[PDB]
Amino acid sequence: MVNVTVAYQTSAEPAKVAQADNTFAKESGATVDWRKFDSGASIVRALASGDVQIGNLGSSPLAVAASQQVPIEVFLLASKLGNSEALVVKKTISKPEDLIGKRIAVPFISTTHYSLLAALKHWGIKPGQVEIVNLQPPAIIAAWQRGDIDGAYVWAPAVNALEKDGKVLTDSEQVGQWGAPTLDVWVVRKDFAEKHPEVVKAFAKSAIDAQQPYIANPDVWLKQPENISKLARLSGVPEGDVPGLVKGNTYLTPQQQTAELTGPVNKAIIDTAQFLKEQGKVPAVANDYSQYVTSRFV
């Protein structure tokens, strides 16, 4: 009997159908404790302490973890992040320079913290000119409802809660085009990968398999009602928001997973770590992160 704790996050993406279906548990034979985390920083800490063995990390928490030499490896990609996450601001904030003096929330060292700093740099705004406050997404929603913040760079469900009365100022598809793309990945502790490699392979298989029908034909996948309801439930968004969220990322074929895990992801960590160091968020970085990536489970 194998027990495994999987840290998941509130993305509405096609592999959530496998989570809802319990496919990984059924195919691996393991007892799977799916634990929801509000953002990636707390997942890194749980990975490091051993409380979580498989976790969904954004590329920015990944880079932080790898620079701290946490013994984890990316073993597949969840998605390439696009306008599924966005900077949403009070409607009176109409142009980037209106952000100066305003109070903008992000979860600390998340992909949207990283994307905010990259967007500010692109706009020629020093980060200190904005009151960047660190809040978890549920607290961001509550702070927005009470008018205590002027905006936030967030993912689902907070991005959809805020956009209902706010304005999108930029998004992570644009920030990627500017030269600061972000990724969503799955990582595994070394000791778990050593003891239970077939369980790790089963996890990767269940996620990759679940995304392929969407990749093959997004519109056909999105009109299957059970695909939409499973994503709405696990992410916490209304069903009407799911299609735009799903189409706000791109996903990988098995061939693309192997290709990405053999070079591109390493380069992504190198570059993400470097920008985080320039923004003063990590003290030291490396010129190579090949220890933190593997294709052997796909």
mmCIF file of C-alpha atoms in Angstrom:
data_model
loop_
_atom_site.group_PDB
_atom_site.id
_atom_site.type_symbol
_atom_site.label_atom_id
_atom_site.label_comp_id
_atom_site.label_asym_id
_atom_site.label_seq_id
_atom_site.Cartn_x
_atom_site.Cartn_y
_atom_site.Cartn_z
ATOM 1 C CA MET A 1 0.000 0.000 0.000
ATOM 2 C CA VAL A 2 1.328 3.360 -1.213
ATOM 3 C CA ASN A 3 0.113 6.675 0.213
ATOM 4 C CA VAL A 4 0.869 9.860 -1.710
ATOM 5 C CA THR A 5 -0.071 13.490 -1.049
ATOM 6 C CA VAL A 6 -0.581 15.583 -4.204
ATOM 7 C CA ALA A 7 -0.640 19.391 -3.898
ATOM 8 C CA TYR A 8 -2.981 20.801 -6.524
ATOM 9 C CA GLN A 9 -4.085 24.326 -7.427
ATOM 10 C CA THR A 10 -7.279 25.940 -8.735
ATOM 11 C CA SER A 11 -6.573 25.986 -12.481
ATOM 12 C CA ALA A 12 -9.465 25.070 -14.766
ATOM 13 C CA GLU A 13 -7.482 22.930 -17.213
ATOM 14 C CA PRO A 14 -8.335 19.646 -18.968
ATOM 15 C CA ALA A 15 -6.336 17.353 -16.676
ATOM 16 C CA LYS A 16 -8.798 18.275 -13.919
ATOM 17 C CA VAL A 17 -11.102 15.688 -15.516
ATOM 18 C CA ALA A 18 -8.632 12.976 -14.472
ATOM 19 C CA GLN A 19 -8.546 14.384 -10.936
ATOM 20 C CA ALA A 20 -12.344 14.406 -10.716
ATOM 21 C CA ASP A 21 -12.436 10.870 -12.183
ATOM 22 C CA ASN A 22 -9.839 9.632 -9.614
ATOM 23 C CA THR A 23 -7.944 8.083 -12.546
ATOM 24 C CA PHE A 24 -4.471 8.386 -10.997
ATOM 25 C CA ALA A 25 -5.538 6.571 -7.818
ATOM 26 C CA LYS A 26 -7.396 3.910 -9.795
ATOM 27 C CA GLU A 27 -4.514 3.244 -12.219
ATOM 28 C CA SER A 28 -1.628 3.472 -9.749
ATOM 29 C CA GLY A 29 -3.374 1.595 -6.955
ATOM 30 C CA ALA A 30 -2.178 4.245 -4.492
ATOM 31 C CA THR A 31 -4.237 6.046 -1.870
ATOM 32 C CA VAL A 32 -4.143 9.665 -3.049
ATOM 33 C CA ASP A 33 -4.693 12.623 -0.720
ATOM 34 C CA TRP A 34 -5.454 15.543 -3.043
ATOM 35 C CA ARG A 35 -4.690 18.689 -1.017
ATOM 36 C CA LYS A 36 -5.627 22.127 -2.359
ATOM 37 C CA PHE A 37 -3.028 24.877 -1.942
ATOM 38 C CA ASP A 38 -3.695 28.562 -2.471
ATOM 39 C CA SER A 39 -0.426 29.225 -4.350
ATOM 40 C CA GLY A 40 2.993 27.747 -5.086
ATOM 41 C CA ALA A 41 5.106 29.191 -2.258
ATOM 42 C CA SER A 42 3.377 27.038 0.368
ATOM 43 C CA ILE A 43 3.687 24.017 -1.924
ATOM 44 C CA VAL A 44 7.475 24.467 -2.059
ATOM 45 C CA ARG A 45 7.586 24.485 1.739
ATOM 46 C CA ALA A 46 5.430 21.331 1.916
ATOM 47 C CA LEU A 47 7.615 19.649 -0.704
ATOM 48 C CA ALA A 48 10.757 20.534 1.255
ATOM 49 C CA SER A 49 9.365 19.272 4.568
ATOM 50 C CA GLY A 50 8.117 16.042 2.981
ATOM 51 C CA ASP A 51 4.415 16.712 3.619
ATOM 52 C CA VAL A 52 3.744 16.661 -0.140
ATOM 53 C CA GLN A 53 5.384 14.299 -2.647
ATOM 54 C CA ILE A 54 3.907 15.492 -5.959
ATOM 55 C CA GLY A 55 3.020 19.149 -6.465
ATOM 56 C CA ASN A 56 1.803 21.597 -9.088
ATOM 57 C CA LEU A 57 4.199 24.586 -9.154
ATOM 58 C CA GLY A 58 4.298 27.637 -11.339
ATOM 59 C CA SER A 59 7.628 28.307 -13.019
ATOM 60 C CA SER A 60 8.418 31.118 -10.557
ATOM 61 C CA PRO A 61 8.009 29.022 -7.357
ATOM 62 C CA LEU A 62 9.872 26.265 -9.208
ATOM 63 C CA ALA A 63 12.842 28.561 -9.803
ATOM 64 C CA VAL A 64 12.844 29.620 -6.143
ATOM 65 C CA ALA A 65 12.711 25.980 -5.034
ATOM 66 C CA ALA A 66 15.506 24.955 -7.397
ATOM 67 C CA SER A 67 17.721 27.813 -6.267
ATOM 68 C CA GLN A 68 17.201 26.625 -2.664
ATOM 69 C CA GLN A 69 18.293 23.113 -3.804
ATOM 70 C CA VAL A 70 14.993 21.501 -2.806
ATOM 71 C CA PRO A 71 15.275 17.877 -4.045
ATOM 72 C CA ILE A 72 12.435 17.920 -6.585
ATOM 73 C CA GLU A 73 12.242 17.416 -10.349
ATOM 74 C CA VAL A 74 9.839 18.631 -12.991
ATOM 75 C CA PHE A 75 8.508 15.429 -14.555
ATOM 76 C CA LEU A 76 5.819 16.906 -16.771
ATOM 77 C CA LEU A 77 4.320 20.195 -17.835
ATOM 78 C CA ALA A 78 0.774 21.129 -16.887
ATOM 79 C CA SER A 79 0.473 24.034 -19.330
ATOM 80 C CA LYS A 80 2.053 27.058 -20.969
ATOM 81 C CA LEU A 81 0.279 29.971 -19.285
ATOM 82 C CA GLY A 82 -1.563 32.547 -21.392
ATOM 83 C CA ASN A 83 -4.450 34.890 -20.636
ATOM 84 C CA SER A 84 -5.874 32.439 -18.071
ATOM 85 C CA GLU A 85 -4.152 34.708 -15.550
ATOM 86 C CA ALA A 86 -4.335 38.460 -15.760
ATOM 87 C CA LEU A 87 -3.774 41.784 -14.033
ATOM 88 C CA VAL A 88 -7.276 43.019 -13.106
ATOM 89 C CA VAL A 89 -7.646 46.583 -11.814
ATOM 90 C CA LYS A 90 -10.322 49.000 -10.688
ATOM 91 C CA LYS A 91 -11.967 50.413 -13.793
ATOM 92 C CA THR A 92 -10.655 53.928 -13.099
ATOM 93 C CA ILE A 93 -7.139 52.538 -13.681
ATOM 94 C CA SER A 94 -7.069 52.848 -17.467
ATOM 95 C CA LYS A 95 -3.373 52.946 -18.440
ATOM 96 C CA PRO A 96 -0.183 51.439 -16.953
ATOM 97 C CA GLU A 97 0.972 54.753 -15.464
ATOM 98 C CA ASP A 98 -2.253 54.900 -13.431
ATOM 99 C CA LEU A 99 -0.791 52.014 -11.404
ATOM 100 C CA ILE A 100 1.671 54.332 -9.647
ATOM 101 C CA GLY A 101 0.618 54.861 -6.047
ATOM 102 C CA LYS A 102 -1.960 52.072 -6.267
ATOM 103 C CA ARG A 103 -2.248 48.935 -4.138
ATOM 104 C CA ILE A 104 -1.877 45.770 -6.248
ATOM 105 C CA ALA A 105 -1.987 42.283 -4.748
ATOM 106 C CA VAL A 106 -0.201 39.101 -5.830
ATOM 107 C CA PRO A 107 0.592 35.850 -4.034
ATOM 108 C CA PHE A 108 4.303 36.000 -3.142
ATOM 109 C CA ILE A 109 6.691 34.672 -5.871
ATOM 110 C CA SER A 110 3.821 33.121 -7.804
ATOM 111 C CA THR A 111 3.754 33.233 -11.607
ATOM 112 C CA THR A 112 1.560 36.346 -11.377
ATOM 113 C CA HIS A 113 3.970 38.036 -8.957
ATOM 114 C CA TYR A 114 6.673 37.259 -11.525
ATOM 115 C CA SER A 115 4.453 38.420 -14.378
ATOM 116 C CA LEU A 116 3.546 41.659 -12.578
ATOM 117 C CA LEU A 117 7.223 42.514 -12.067
ATOM 118 C CA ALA A 118 7.921 41.708 -15.712
ATOM 119 C CA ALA A 119 4.960 43.816 -16.861
ATOM 120 C CA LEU A 120 6.058 46.758 -14.703
ATOM 121 C CA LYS A 121 9.554 46.469 -16.151
ATOM 122 C CA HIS A 122 8.138 46.454 -19.684
ATOM 123 C CA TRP A 123 6.035 49.539 -18.865
ATOM 124 C CA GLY A 124 9.036 51.402 -17.399
ATOM 125 C CA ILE A 125 7.537 51.473 -13.889
ATOM 126 C CA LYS A 126 9.808 50.768 -10.964
ATOM 127 C CA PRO A 127 8.183 48.191 -8.655
ATOM 128 C CA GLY A 128 8.515 50.490 -5.650
ATOM 129 C CA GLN A 129 6.207 52.999 -7.358
ATOM 130 C CA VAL A 130 3.400 50.466 -6.808
ATOM 131 C CA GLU A 131 2.293 49.195 -3.407
ATOM 132 C CA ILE A 132 2.720 45.504 -4.228
ATOM 133 C CA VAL A 133 1.109 43.554 -1.384
ATOM 134 C CA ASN A 134 1.264 39.817 -0.859
ATOM 135 C CA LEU A 135 -2.072 38.078 -0.286
ATOM 136 C CA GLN A 136 -3.395 34.622 -1.077
ATOM 137 C CA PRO A 137 -6.153 34.496 -3.734
ATOM 138 C CA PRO A 138 -9.114 34.099 -1.325
ATOM 139 C CA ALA A 139 -7.914 37.098 0.661
ATOM 140 C CA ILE A 140 -7.395 39.006 -2.612
ATOM 141 C CA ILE A 141 -11.055 38.495 -3.510
ATOM 142 C CA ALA A 142 -12.175 39.698 -0.078
ATOM 143 C CA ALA A 143 -9.851 42.701 -0.213
ATOM 144 C CA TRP A 144 -11.147 43.597 -3.665
ATOM 145 C CA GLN A 145 -14.758 43.323 -2.484
ATOM 146 C CA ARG A 146 -14.062 45.844 0.292
ATOM 147 C CA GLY A 147 -12.081 48.175 -1.987
ATOM 148 C CA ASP A 148 -8.912 47.721 0.087
ATOM 149 C CA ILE A 149 -6.847 46.934 -3.036
ATOM 150 C CA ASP A 150 -6.918 48.557 -6.462
ATOM 151 C CA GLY A 151 -6.152 45.427 -8.470
ATOM 152 C CA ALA A 152 -4.415 42.086 -8.516
ATOM 153 C CA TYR A 153 -2.551 39.770 -10.871
ATOM 154 C CA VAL A 154 -4.348 36.473 -10.310
ATOM 155 C CA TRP A 155 -5.493 33.152 -11.767
ATOM 156 C CA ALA A 156 -8.809 31.305 -11.428
ATOM 157 C CA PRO A 157 -11.070 31.699 -9.513
ATOM 158 C CA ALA A 158 -9.834 35.077 -8.329
ATOM 159 C CA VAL A 159 -9.188 36.359 -11.852
ATOM 160 C CA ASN A 160 -12.823 35.729 -12.773
ATOM 161 C CA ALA A 161 -14.185 37.150 -9.522
ATOM 162 C CA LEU A 162 -12.291 40.410 -10.073
ATOM 163 C CA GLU A 163 -12.967 40.740 -13.794
ATOM 164 C CA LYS A 164 -16.723 40.679 -13.098
ATOM 165 C CA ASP A 165 -16.412 44.318 -11.948
ATOM 166 C CA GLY A 166 -12.860 45.204 -13.026
ATOM 167 C CA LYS A 167 -10.709 45.763 -16.118
ATOM 168 C CA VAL A 168 -7.929 43.629 -17.601
ATOM 169 C CA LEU A 169 -4.761 45.721 -17.915
ATOM 170 C CA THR A 170 -2.478 42.936 -19.180
ATOM 171 C CA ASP A 171 -2.311 39.149 -19.164
ATOM 172 C CA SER A 172 0.280 36.420 -19.194
ATOM 173 C CA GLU A 173 -0.051 35.774 -22.925
ATOM 174 C CA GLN A 174 1.073 39.380 -23.482
ATOM 175 C CA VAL A 175 3.749 39.190 -20.790
ATOM 176 C CA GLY A 176 5.053 36.052 -22.468
ATOM 177 C CA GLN A 177 5.272 37.856 -25.805
ATOM 178 C CA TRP A 178 7.242 40.585 -24.012
ATOM 179 C CA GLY A 179 9.863 37.998 -23.069
ATOM 180 C CA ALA A 180 8.760 36.664 -19.665
ATOM 181 C CA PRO A 181 6.665 33.538 -20.321
ATOM 182 C CA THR A 182 5.393 31.474 -17.409
ATOM 183 C CA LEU A 183 4.733 27.728 -17.117
ATOM 184 C CA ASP A 184 2.711 25.443 -14.881
ATOM 185 C CA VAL A 185 4.531 22.143 -14.043
ATOM 186 C CA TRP A 186 4.319 19.023 -11.889
ATOM 187 C CA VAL A 187 7.262 18.168 -9.638
ATOM 188 C CA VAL A 188 8.141 15.136 -7.518
ATOM 189 C CA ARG A 189 10.396 14.630 -4.486
ATOM 190 C CA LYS A 190 13.483 12.522 -5.203
ATOM 191 C CA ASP A 191 12.820 10.060 -2.389
ATOM 192 C CA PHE A 192 9.302 9.361 -3.665
ATOM 193 C CA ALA A 193 10.518 8.991 -7.253
ATOM 194 C CA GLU A 194 13.187 6.554 -6.019
ATOM 195 C CA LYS A 195 10.783 4.375 -4.035
ATOM 196 C CA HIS A 196 7.654 4.518 -6.255
ATOM 197 C CA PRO A 197 8.675 5.181 -9.882
ATOM 198 C CA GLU A 198 5.655 3.332 -11.287
ATOM 199 C CA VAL A 199 3.356 5.587 -9.248
ATOM 200 C CA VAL A 200 5.046 8.683 -10.686
ATOM 201 C CA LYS A 201 4.673 7.259 -14.200
ATOM 202 C CA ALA A 202 0.991 6.630 -13.489
ATOM 203 C CA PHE A 203 0.519 10.237 -12.418
ATOM 204 C CA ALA A 204 2.118 11.565 -15.609
ATOM 205 C CA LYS A 205 0.117 9.147 -17.745
ATOM 206 C CA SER A 206 -3.212 10.120 -16.180
ATOM 207 C CA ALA A 207 -2.585 13.846 -16.722
ATOM 208 C CA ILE A 208 -1.112 13.596 -20.232
ATOM 209 C CA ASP A 209 -3.879 11.227 -21.346
ATOM 210 C CA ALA A 210 -6.548 13.624 -20.043
ATOM 211 C CA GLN A 211 -5.228 16.594 -21.991
ATOM 212 C CA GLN A 212 -4.948 14.850 -25.370
ATOM 213 C CA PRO A 213 -8.703 14.869 -26.257
ATOM 214 C CA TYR A 214 -8.725 18.609 -25.658
ATOM 215 C CA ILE A 215 -5.599 19.151 -27.784
ATOM 216 C CA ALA A 216 -7.065 17.027 -30.592
ATOM 217 C CA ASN A 217 -10.167 19.235 -30.860
ATOM 218 C CA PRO A 218 -10.811 21.958 -28.244
ATOM 219 C CA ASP A 219 -14.364 22.772 -29.379
ATOM 220 C CA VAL A 220 -15.478 19.142 -29.310
ATOM 221 C CA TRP A 221 -13.902 18.638 -25.887
ATOM 222 C CA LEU A 222 -15.501 21.796 -24.502
ATOM 223 C CA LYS A 223 -19.008 20.788 -25.597
ATOM 224 C CA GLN A 224 -18.924 17.597 -23.535
ATOM 225 C CA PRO A 225 -20.837 18.819 -20.439
ATOM 226 C CA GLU A 226 -18.981 16.598 -17.954
ATOM 227 C CA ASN A 227 -15.663 18.157 -18.989
ATOM 228 C CA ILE A 228 -16.971 21.621 -18.124
ATOM 229 C CA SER A 229 -18.649 20.633 -14.831
ATOM 230 C CA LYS A 230 -15.574 18.793 -13.543
ATOM 231 C CA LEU A 231 -13.370 21.826 -14.205
ATOM 232 C CA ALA A 232 -15.880 24.271 -12.716
ATOM 233 C CA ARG A 233 -16.100 22.181 -9.544
ATOM 234 C CA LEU A 234 -12.397 21.663 -8.870
ATOM 235 C CA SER A 235 -11.385 25.236 -9.744
ATOM 236 C CA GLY A 236 -14.401 26.876 -8.093
ATOM 237 C CA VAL A 237 -15.588 28.904 -11.100
ATOM 238 C CA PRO A 238 -19.019 29.132 -12.758
ATOM 239 C CA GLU A 239 -19.391 26.822 -15.727
ATOM 240 C CA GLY A 240 -19.651 29.807 -18.082
ATOM 241 C CA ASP A 241 -16.082 30.843 -17.232
ATOM 242 C CA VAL A 242 -14.464 27.452 -17.894
ATOM 243 C CA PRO A 243 -14.102 27.664 -21.724
ATOM 244 C CA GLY A 244 -12.242 30.988 -21.704
ATOM 245 C CA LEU A 245 -9.980 29.744 -18.930
ATOM 246 C CA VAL A 246 -9.138 26.499 -20.737
ATOM 247 C CA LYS A 247 -8.448 28.315 -23.999
ATOM 248 C CA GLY A 248 -6.202 30.717 -22.029
ATOM 249 C CA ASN A 249 -3.301 28.225 -21.997
ATOM 250 C CA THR A 250 -1.699 25.809 -24.409
ATOM 251 C CA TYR A 251 -1.046 22.157 -23.586
ATOM 252 C CA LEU A 252 1.388 19.483 -24.715
ATOM 253 C CA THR A 253 1.262 16.278 -26.703
ATOM 254 C CA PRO A 254 3.394 13.380 -25.429
ATOM 255 C CA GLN A 255 5.971 14.252 -28.087
ATOM 256 C CA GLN A 256 5.966 17.859 -26.881
ATOM 257 C CA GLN A 257 6.353 16.789 -23.241
ATOM 258 C CA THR A 258 9.498 14.819 -24.029
ATOM 259 C CA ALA A 259 10.821 17.668 -26.184
ATOM 260 C CA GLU A 260 10.162 20.318 -23.534
ATOM 261 C CA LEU A 261 11.633 18.233 -20.693
ATOM 262 C CA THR A 262 14.840 17.824 -22.741
ATOM 263 C CA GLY A 263 16.212 21.361 -22.725
ATOM 264 C CA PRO A 264 13.445 23.959 -22.909
ATOM 265 C CA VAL A 265 12.331 23.594 -19.263
ATOM 266 C CA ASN A 266 15.927 23.841 -18.021
ATOM 267 C CA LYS A 267 16.333 27.071 -20.011
ATOM 268 C CA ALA A 268 13.026 28.315 -18.576
ATOM 269 C CA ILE A 269 14.291 27.781 -14.987
ATOM 270 C CA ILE A 270 17.641 29.441 -15.744
ATOM 271 C CA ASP A 271 15.928 32.506 -17.199
ATOM 272 C CA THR A 272 13.187 32.659 -14.544
ATOM 273 C CA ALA A 273 15.751 32.405 -11.750
ATOM 274 C CA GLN A 274 17.838 35.164 -13.345
ATOM 275 C CA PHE A 275 14.952 37.637 -13.524
ATOM 276 C CA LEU A 276 13.971 36.783 -9.949
ATOM 277 C CA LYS A 277 17.532 37.545 -8.870
ATOM 278 C CA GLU A 278 17.499 40.852 -10.757
ATOM 279 C CA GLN A 279 14.207 41.744 -9.043
ATOM 280 C CA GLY A 280 15.860 40.907 -5.710
ATOM 281 C CA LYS A 281 13.657 37.918 -4.893
ATOM 282 C CA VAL A 282 16.354 35.217 -4.780
ATOM 283 C CA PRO A 283 19.930 35.774 -3.528
ATOM 284 C CA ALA A 284 21.865 33.390 -5.789
ATOM 285 C CA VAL A 285 21.179 31.489 -9.015
ATOM 286 C CA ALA A 286 22.874 28.853 -11.171
ATOM 287 C CA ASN A 287 23.632 28.765 -14.876
ATOM 288 C CA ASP A 288 22.081 25.284 -15.142
ATOM 289 C CA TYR A 289 19.100 23.506 -13.577
ATOM 290 C CA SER A 290 19.259 20.111 -15.306
ATOM 291 C CA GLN A 291 19.076 18.440 -11.870
ATOM 292 C CA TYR A 292 15.501 19.797 -11.545
ATOM 293 C CA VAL A 293 14.028 18.362 -14.776
ATOM 294 C CA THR A 294 13.560 14.868 -16.174
ATOM 295 C CA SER A 295 11.860 13.127 -19.079
ATOM 296 C CA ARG A 296 12.157 9.652 -17.578
ATOM 297 C CA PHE A 297 8.541 9.484 -16.373
ATOM 298 C CA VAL A 298 6.806 10.346 -19.665
#
